[PDB]
């Protein structure tokens, strides 16, 4: 199987390919084609997902408590991160002056 048959970089006709087997065909088919059967009909899936829903509700429920603390904490991070991290990169670039005028004093 090669793209010699297929015309390698452009059809000129209606798409009607027959089925052929190429690398990761039977792999990714068996992943998703079997998945869909358990998604579309199922009496086993939707209950599990309704309890996954319940673990998802729980995480937003845990979250809204943490959000109220992050409303205090990340507020104190955000405002200070404008000052402190700027002051740090100030000293990174201001060091090039300290490199220069100090070395001038040597000689």
């Amino acid at each position: 199987y090669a793209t010699r048959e297929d015309a390698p970089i452009g059809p000129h006709l209606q798409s009607m390919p027959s089925e052929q087997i190429r690398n990761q065909l039977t792999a990714m088919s068996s992943v998703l084609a079997k998945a869909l059967e358990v998604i579309k009909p199922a009496h086993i899936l939707q209950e599990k997902e309704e309890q996954h829903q319940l673990a998802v509700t729980a995480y937003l429920k845990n979250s809204r408590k943490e959000h109220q603390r992050i409303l205090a904490r990340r507020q104190t991070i955000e405002e200070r991160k404008e000052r402190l991290e700027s002051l740090n990169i100030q000293r990174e670039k201001e060091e090039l002056e300290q490199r220069e005028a100090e070395l001038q004093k040597v000689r």
Binding site: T3, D6, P8, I9, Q20, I21, R22, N23, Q24, L25, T26, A27, M28, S29, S30, V31, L32, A33, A35, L36, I39, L45, Q46, E49, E50, H52, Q53, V56, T57, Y59, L60, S63, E66, H67, I70, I77, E78, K81, E82, E85, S86, N88, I89, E92, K93
Partner: protein, 324 residues
């Protein structure tokens, strides 16, 4: 402490960053490597956390041309006003052909890293590498080269900094293993958009099917790697050829000329004897291949190790699946 060397910790790239990267996914810089944005973050527990990026666009008609920094200055104020500050601690070029750290990307990085040593340089690699392994490639520059700072010139400080022998297989940090703590909202959307509105979930997941079947993925990978890598291989070989000839093959002839002189004339010079060895440009160890080229040997081994793997998986699945 997984923290990095001598000014910085690791990196953590929050999901809302990578969403904004895949918005300027692989266009606006397809066949041209374009710096698609700066990574703005903050120092967190054992890591940086890139919490937001803003993209940096350029004049991308079919070539890239650098523009006024009126964009970046106004846009980093635009971030500062509603959100944090200009806190550019890295950058991401996605961009062009599965993860590769070019000599230009090493030089742009060297200017970036020496200026702000709180940095990594990201290479966001989507489906182009056959996805594939190491989708987020981080990489910061060795602080050794930020101590034998500028410049690696062709004869002096190529040889001398080759002899110092700073890393060029240098370590790359892990990026995620933890709760980022902005999991929160996007967690709540999962239950909605699975089962009872799994349209857009299943749409994304069934992308896999057509990653296998159709036109020449691994084939084209191995094709582009048949060309990319043989180019680089030939280059080192003819580079090494000429330099090794100036190193030994020229010494061979001129020292056999030094024979003829008899290595001394007492009454007067020894002009000829003196004017043997007069410098050709490499005396030893052309550095920019030895360092920066070798960073791409590593990346070419990575591309090979990537393109191999998904092949290995099929070679299990194919045999086995039919075996029933």
């Amino acid at each position: 402490g997984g923290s990095g060397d001598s000014a910085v910790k690791q990196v953590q790239i929050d999901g809302l960053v990578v969403l904004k990267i895949i918005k300027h996914y692989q266009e606006e810089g397809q066949g041209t490597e374009v710096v698609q944005g700066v990574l703005l973050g903050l120092v967190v527990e054992d890591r940086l956390e890139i919490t937001n990026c803003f993209p940096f666009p350029q004049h991308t008609e079919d070539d890239a041309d650098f523009d006024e920094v009126q964009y970046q200055m106004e846009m980093m104020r635009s971030l500062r006003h509603v959100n944090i500050d200009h806190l550019h601690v890295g950058w991401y070029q996605s961009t062009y052909y599965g993860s590769f750290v070019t000599r230009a990307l090493l030089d742009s990085q060297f200017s970036y890293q020496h200026a702000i040593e709180e940095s990594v340089v990201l290479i966001y690699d989507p489906i182009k590498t056959a996805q594939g392994s190491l989708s987020l490639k981080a990489y910061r520059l060795t602080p050794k080269l930020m101590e034998v700072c500028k410049e690696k010139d062709f004869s002096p400080e190529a040889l001398k900094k080759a002899n110092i022998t700073f890393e060029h297989m240098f370590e790359e940090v892990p990026i995620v293993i933890k709760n980022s703590h902005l999991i929160n909202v996007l967690m709540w959307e999962l239950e909605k958009k699975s089962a009872v509105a799994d349209k857009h979930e299943l749409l994304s997941l069934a992308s896999s099917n057509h990653l296998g079947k159709n036109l020449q993925l691994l084939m084209d990978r191995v094709d582009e790697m048949s060309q990319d890598i043989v180019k680089y291989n030939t280059y080192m070989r003819n580079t090494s050829k000429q330099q090794q000839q100036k190193h030994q093959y020229q010494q061979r002839r001129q020292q056999e000329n030094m024979q003829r002189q008899s290595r001394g004339e007492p009454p007067l010079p020894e002009e000829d004897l003196s004017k043997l060895f007069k410098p050709p440009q490499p005396p030893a160890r052309m550095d920019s291949l030895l360092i920066a080229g070798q960073i791409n040997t590593y990346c070419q081994n990575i591309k090979e190790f990537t393109a191999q793997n998904l092949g290995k998986l099929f070679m299990a699945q194919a045999l086995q699946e039919y075996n029933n």
